[PDB]
Amino acid sequence: YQLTSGYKPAPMDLSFIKLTPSQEAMVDKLAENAHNVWARDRIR
Structure with missing residues (x-):
């Protein structure tokens, strides 16, 4: 798993x-x- 910066998400395989x-x-x-x-909404 990679290096994180405060939070490490890896729940399951997708x-x-x-x-x-x-x-x-x-x-x-x-x-x-x-x-x-x-x-x-972004006509201009």
């Missing part, structure tokens, strides 16, 4: 169950949604 390509498309869905709501 990359065991591999993400599906539908999850990789939903990653783009969430990112597109977030950036579009952002530019919906």
